[PDB]
Amino acid sequence: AVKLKTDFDNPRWIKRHKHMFDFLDINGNGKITLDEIVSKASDDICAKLEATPEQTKRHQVCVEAFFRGCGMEYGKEIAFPQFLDGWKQLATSELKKWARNEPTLIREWGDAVFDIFDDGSGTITLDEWKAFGKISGISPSQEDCEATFRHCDLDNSGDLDVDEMTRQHLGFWYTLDPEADGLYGNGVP
Numbered sequence: 001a002v003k004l005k006t007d008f009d010n011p012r013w014i015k016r017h018k019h020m021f022d023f024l025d026i027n028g029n030g031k032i033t034l035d036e037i038v039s040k041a042s043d044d045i046c047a048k049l050e051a052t053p054e055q056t057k058r059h060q061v062c063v064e065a066f067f068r069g070c071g072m073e074y075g076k077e078i079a080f081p082q083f084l085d086g087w088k089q090l091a092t093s094e095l096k097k098w099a100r101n102e103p104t105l106i107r108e109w110g111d112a113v114f115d116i117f118d119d120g121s122g123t124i125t126l127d128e129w130k131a132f133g134k135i136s137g138i139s140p141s142q143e144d145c146e147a148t149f150r151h152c153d154l155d156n157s158g159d160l161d162v163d164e165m166t167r168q169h170l171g172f173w174y175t176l177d178p179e180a181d182g183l184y185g186n187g188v189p
């Protein structure tokens with residue numbers, strides 16, 4: 001049962017997003033732009049994963065929509081306090097879509113990531129997730145990727161499906177659901 005009540009003043013939720021903001025803030029100057037985030041998505045990640053041009057474009061559209069949802073825009077430098085305010089708005093919007101069974105931006109981003117790794121179908125193997133964790137940088141420890149797979153409910157083949165990862169991500173990024181704690185092992189607090 002996905003937790004839908006927000007916990008935006010909990011220091012653990014704040015710290016999770018500050019950890020991610022600093023991870024996005026490559027030069028350490030306390031500011032990030034949508035340009036930087038889309039370059040990470042397309043020039044770095046999709047290139048290394050050998051995504052097709054169509055896949056790369058779809059993933060880029062999803063990343064653009066997701067981070068515009070938390071107030072970022074091309075040419076706009078955003079610092080952490082405003083980024084966190086944006087995340088509150090994003091979470092509020094996403095949870096209302098989820099409750100109405102309207103596709104969320106986090107689900108659509110997930111569909112784009114999973115499609116790059118697609119035999120059949122809408123699943124990711126542990127080896128594929130370990131590669132993603134290194135290439136995205138969100139989880140470069142293969143042990144942390146292993147923990148993700150232990151944490152989640154996997155399919156019959158031991159693979160992860162986008163429905164499961166979506167439910168986990170709602171709890172991890174938006175509501176600080178205790179059921180999502182540990183989703184990224186020790187890699188993301």
Ligand SMILES: O=C1N2C=C(c3ccc(O)cc3)N=C(Cc3ccccc3)C2=N[C@@]1(Cc1ccc(O)cc1)OO
Pocket residue numbers: 016017018020021024037038040041045063106109110111113136138162165166169173
């Ligand atoms: O969830 C994810 N992420 C969340 C944040 C992030 C960033 C800032 C925050 O404050 C909080 C979270 N940053 C990145 C890494 C990334 C960022 C920008 C562009 C491309 C990749 C990231 N990669 C994902 C991609 C994903 C999405 C849905 C799935 O089903 C599977 C995989 O899996 O971990």
